[PDB]
Ligand binder design. Structure first.
Ligand SMILES: [Ca+2]
Length: 240
């Protein structure tokens, strides 16, 4: 997250760190959202590589003992069947991870609430992106979980020529684009939390930013629209 602030440790308890094994250690690669005690929602592109993955819930600082973490292996990966890694613009950037164990819930570890199917946010709706992704274009991962206020940019504006044009689909949410705040590499797969009727819900799964840079004006961060995938999510969980 470029232009973020450090999140309070109990603000976003559904945020997870998706990590891969690298040598004798683990490296953060993506975010995710805990959606059942044994299921995480993330981006399909996060799991394109044939890696050993684990999830950390109750994570705040990637580089220090928080005293709240639970580390759990990924047991099964179910990528959306229409995902194509060389066509992120087509959409379908979503995957579910079944965890090896059911995590224990507490103020640091909670299920993310998803919107009702079909819900589309009005332009300029209030949301926060969260994650450990780069803090500058071509920068480095954050140590502490970051948040940035990224209001939505509706489909009509987001798909206009000076924004994303044809690249954005109605199955996506755009947010931000102010040239200061954005998602960045390593935020992918994590939530866009939007405040509606007094409650935050996870309306987005971080999918892409401009190839030119993270915080590029009129290139808002683009998210998979969770509310387009409610039936898909429920079907996968019911069948697994
Ligand atoms: Ca930690």
């Amino acid at each position: 997250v470029v232009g973020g602030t450090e999140a309070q440790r109990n603000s976003w308890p559904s945020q997870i760190s998706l990590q891969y094994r690298s040598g004798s250690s683990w490296a953060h690669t993506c975010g995710g959202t805990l959606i059942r005690q044994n299921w995480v929602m993330t981006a399909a592109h996060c799991v394109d590589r044939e890696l050993t993955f684990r999830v950390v819930v109750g994570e705040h600082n990637l580089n220090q003992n928080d005293g709240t973490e639970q580390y759990v292996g990924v047991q099964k990966i179910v990528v959306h069947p229409y995902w194509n890694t060389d066509d992120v613009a087509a959409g379908y950037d979503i995957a579910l991870l079944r965890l090896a164990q059911s995590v224990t819930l507490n103020s640091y570890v909670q299920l993310g609430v998803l919107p009702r199917a079909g819900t589309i946010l009005a332009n300029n709706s209030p949301c926060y992106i969260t994650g450990w992704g780069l803090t500058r274009t071509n920068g480095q991962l954050a140590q502490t979980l970051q948040q940035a206020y990224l209001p939505t940019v509706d489909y009509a504006i987001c798909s206009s020529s000076s924004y994303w044009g044809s690249t954005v689909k109605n199955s996506m949410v755009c947010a931000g684009g102010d040239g200061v705040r954005s998602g960045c590499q390593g935020d992918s797969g994590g939530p866009l939390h939007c405040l509606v009727n007094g409650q935050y819900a996870v309306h987005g799964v971080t999918s892409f930013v401009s190839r030119l840079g993270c915080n590029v004006t009129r290139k808002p961060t683009v998210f998979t629209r969770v509310s387009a995938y409610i039936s898909w999510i429920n079907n996968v969980i019911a069948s697994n």
